[PDB]
């Protein structure tokens, strides 16, 4: 089999930048190298065929180039609708193989997260479970840390964190941190605190509440 290698799985650039995505074949595939674009909604479309040929309908800012085993896809001036995942594909040899894909994201200025903490709903408590939720919204870059404290003591077990995809409007990220306990354990404690640490400040952002009140 022929292995297609896209070394960079994630690439960040600014709008208007010249963006180049690389693709490597484990051996000579001549010029049988195609590029596909996958949108967030799962739609896949042909962009470039035979190394450098632009498919009908595709904006002229897209181009391709190759050298037998080295290939590249270039966007001359990055637009927002170009934010997607790009795959290369060799068609020289069976079985057909793809690169692992390169996902594009946007750069922007650093932004501190807006933090909100939410006690378990009275409804959830009726189920015997208790989820404490912390929203960390509209920050950049994506890297962030959250610490949970219960009655002044750090809690690590029962925490799940989920990041949104980059916001299509302001290019920020958001993350939800959820501490899930049993009802009984939740009611054996009073103070619940979530602490967000982001590169925008040496001081963490702290949101808390007391169960009894």
């Amino acid at each position: 089999d022929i292995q297609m290698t896209q070394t960079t799985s994630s690439l960040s650039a600014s709008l208007g930048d010249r963006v180049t995505i690389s693709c490597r074949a484990s051996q000579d595939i001549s010029n049988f190298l195609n590029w596909y674009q996958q949108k967030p909604d799962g739609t896949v479309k042909l962009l470039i065929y035979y190394t450098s040929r632009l498919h009908s309908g595709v904006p002229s800012r897209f181009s391709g180039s190759g050298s037998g085993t080295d290939f590249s896809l270039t966007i001359s001036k990055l637009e927002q609708e170009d934010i997607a995942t790009y795959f290369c594909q060799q068609g020289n040899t069976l079985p057909l193989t793809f690169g692992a894909g390169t996902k594009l994201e946007l750069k922007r200025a650093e932004a501190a997260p807006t933090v909100s903490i939410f006690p378990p709903s009275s409804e959830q408590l009726t189920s015997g479970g208790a989820s404490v939720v912390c929203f960390l919204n509209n920050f950049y870059p994506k890297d962030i840390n959250v610490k949970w404290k219960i009655d002044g003591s750090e809690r690590q077990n029962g925490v799940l964190n989920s990041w949104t995809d980059q916001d299509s409007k302001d290019s920020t990220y958001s993350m939800s941190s959820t501490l899930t306990l049993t009802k009984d354990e939740y009611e054996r404690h009073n103070s619940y605190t979530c602490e967000a640490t982001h590169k925008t400040s040496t001081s963490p952002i702290v949101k808390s509440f007391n169960r009894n009140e």
Binding site: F87, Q89, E213
Partner: protein
């Protein structure tokens, strides 16, 4: 225009089988090979194999031999793929795509079919309202939440005020929690908006034929 229409999402238990379809229209079915392609987290994009609609001749990626079986019904312009002995690594999105011959590009793709392989049963979500902490929040804006817990399989659809509230919304990707999914969504509005106006989170879970409306009330 050329269209490749794939069948809906499937949930299947480990060890069992599944048969998914790809219905072609807008061209002469026999003019093109039909292919199947797998998109997974573990191995990204993989070519499974192709089939000649005119006679049903198949070519397989050896890696999928013993896993995938391709068939066609040319009278209905439909291609089929059957996956057997299903495991976790089979959970993926499966595409059908055509080409004139294997040196030619995949110029038209189906919309994809999501397969989930799990022992977890179809389960409706519990929907919990997330109102601000009982007693003061800093700022001129207010953030509300909706917690959607313990459903299976994906997906759910979540809206706020039936789409009237669309700005300032973050819906976080669902996470597996003891083989069930949990999702949350936040919405941020001016203090002038809530609680003077009603804000309701709307949750739909098609697999369990469930719709839930949860109004967010002050604690």
């Amino acid at each position: 225009e050329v269209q490749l229409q794939q069948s809906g999402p499937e949930l299947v238990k480990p060890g069992a089988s599944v048969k998914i379809s790809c219905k072609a229209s807008g061209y002469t079915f026999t003019d093109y090979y039909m292919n199947w392609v797998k998109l997974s987290h573990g191995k990204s994009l993989e070519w499974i194999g192709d089939i000649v609609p005119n006679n049903g001749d198949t070519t397989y990626n050896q890696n999928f031999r013993g896993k995938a079986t391709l068939t066609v019904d040319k009278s209905s312009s439909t291609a089929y793929m059957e996956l057997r002995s299903l495991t976790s690594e089979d959970s993926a999105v499966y595409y059908c795509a055509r080409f004139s011959n294997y040196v030619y590009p995949f110029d038209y793709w189906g919309q994809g079919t999501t397969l989930t392989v799990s022992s977890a049963k179809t389960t409706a979500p519990s929907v919990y309202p997330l109102a601000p902490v009982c007693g003061d929040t800093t700022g001129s804006s207010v953030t509300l939440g909706c917690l959607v817990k313990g459903y299976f399989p994906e997906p759910v659809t979540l809206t706020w005020n039936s789409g009237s509230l669309s700005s300032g919304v973050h819906t976080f990707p669902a996470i597996l929690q003891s083989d069930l999914y949990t999702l949350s969504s936040s919405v941020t509005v001016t203090s002038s908006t809530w609680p003077s106006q009603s804000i309701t989170c709307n949750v739909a879970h098609p697999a369990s034929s469930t719709k839930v409306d949860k109004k967010i009330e002050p604690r």
